[PDB]
Amino acid sequence: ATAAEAVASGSGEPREEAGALGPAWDESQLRSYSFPTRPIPRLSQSDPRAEELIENEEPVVLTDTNLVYPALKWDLEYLQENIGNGDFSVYSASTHKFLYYDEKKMANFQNFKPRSNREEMKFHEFVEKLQDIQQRGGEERLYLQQTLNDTVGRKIVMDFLGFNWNWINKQQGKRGWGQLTSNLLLIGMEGNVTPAHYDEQQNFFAQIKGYKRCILFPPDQFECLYPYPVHHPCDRQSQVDFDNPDYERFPNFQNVVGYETVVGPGDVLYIPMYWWHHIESLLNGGITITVNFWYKGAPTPKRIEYPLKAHQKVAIMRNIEKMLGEALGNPQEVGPLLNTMIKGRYN
Amino acid sequence: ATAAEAVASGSGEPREEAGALGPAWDESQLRSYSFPTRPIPRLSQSDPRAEELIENEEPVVLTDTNLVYPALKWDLEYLQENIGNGDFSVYSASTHKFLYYDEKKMANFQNFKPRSNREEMKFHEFVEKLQDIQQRGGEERLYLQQTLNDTVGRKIVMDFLGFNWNWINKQQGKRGWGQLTSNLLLIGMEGNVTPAHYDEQQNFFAQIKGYKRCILFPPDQFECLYPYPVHHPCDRQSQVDFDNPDYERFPNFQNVVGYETVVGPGDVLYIPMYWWHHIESLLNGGITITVNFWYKGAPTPKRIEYPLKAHQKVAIMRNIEKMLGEALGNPQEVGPLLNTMIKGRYN
């Protein structure tokens, strides 16, 4: 166990920046949590180990892909001048945690009161409201999350063309992934947190500005992270408050073990499909900018091999909840029926 | 509540037999259980109330159907002489409870040790072994349960033709039921018990000789009776020992309420599909003879009406367990996956 407490190195020693510009960050900028973590590997695109982790659907930080090299010059001023006049979704929160919720599922749970509110805005309005909160020492927090579409300026389109499509397109092909579905632009304030959740798509997480601490958990820790019901607005998100974990309701969160890393400008983090991930912008680190690359996952293989992988059971559990909500005619009857199936029978 | 304790009349006063032959039975012949019961209605075939109970799939004892009138002369001697030389399944038990188990499902649960053993035998061998146990004051118990097939003697075939097919065929048609699948002949010793279970078929339960106490529970008490897992050999049977109920494992058995009656020669009990039923041959009442009529249930209606009836949810729960056992590739993984879906999520 002595070697275990040491193997839980977190993100390791902060990287030292070229030109002797000091540590990119310090441990004090990271929030404190209850669980141990390991470092995610930081490797080169050409390192065969990095290739072995991606094909095996394990996370890895790639340091030299140049995936978004043209975008590393992006700041609020540059984007305000060239990202066009399209509408940008901007969530507002009283807290540092920006829990994702699906608006379309809010009807099923009318008792659910979100603490993040979405608001369409022009990017210059976001920079303005961003500047106001700063100038007034306000505790309000903002987090821009917008899919990049046709309504972006020419130079932003030229930056896009300058992405390393040769590299990522080859990755898409070698893993059999589906189409690229979107690129989510992410501009958040220091201290912002996206609580733990998993996505049903493969993700290349390309950091542009600022630093983000990424804590991942493999799909086989489903039992420890307690996602919301599938029909709940917070489907795929963890119910556990990482800041105040309730071990009475979530006892197995005391067995969670994460994979952790801090990405900075130029880093690309492969967040494999179904992998949980907790994203937080370093405290007192300024704004963070990121662009992700969401790809549909490979199809289900013709022949199924047993035993099933953890992510396959997650797919099964999700589908069970879905069709029961469909068959019962009401999502809120899924819980009672399942309990009826279990109590005194399987527990 | 005063009127409730009185409304739980059990099987009511024992019937008095024609010709002043005394009470057909006395309360002391009935085993004692922990739950209250109501009387099932005893009505005439021509009573419109009886028609309303069958169409609404509620139990009812019909007193004058003549469904098996030619079979009311049946005894061990008559059957031994005319039921042919076919093989007859005869379960043997150290106890009065003859819990049904599916032999084909015993592979999935190799830790399951049945206490009833099936044995193919000629009917004269059954009468012989029956006579031996008596002559030796043995505690062994037998229960013949055999589907009636082509290998029965001519007179037994003539008795069959003499059944009131006009009446039951009309019932089959007016309820939209499927085909008649089988007629199970049942010859058991006094005190024999078939513990609580439900069948996926409609059943007309035609008593021939002796008396049987039938305790039924509607499908909406699924939560109180705790069937075994679908893949367990005792699928569709209750896990609760009615003689020693374990309220720690089966807490809701303290809310069970049954419908009860004692049928005798000439009575026909409609046991609706999915309805639980506990069958016991009256103590010190001699052998019992019964022939049931199992019909496939009506198809699923084109348009589904919500809310779903209890039996529809039972159909859903059964199918969920089935496809999970199929998808997971192992029945014994159904429990863990369901618990994973529930704990901290729906409970």
Partner: peptide
């Protein structure tokens, strides 16, 4: 069709609100 394939089919939902 195949019950196993029906239950194994993955979705494609991500943390991006749909319009």
């Amino acid at each position: 069709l195949e019950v196993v394939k029906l239950l194994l089919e993955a979705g494609a939902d991500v943390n991006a609100q749909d319009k």
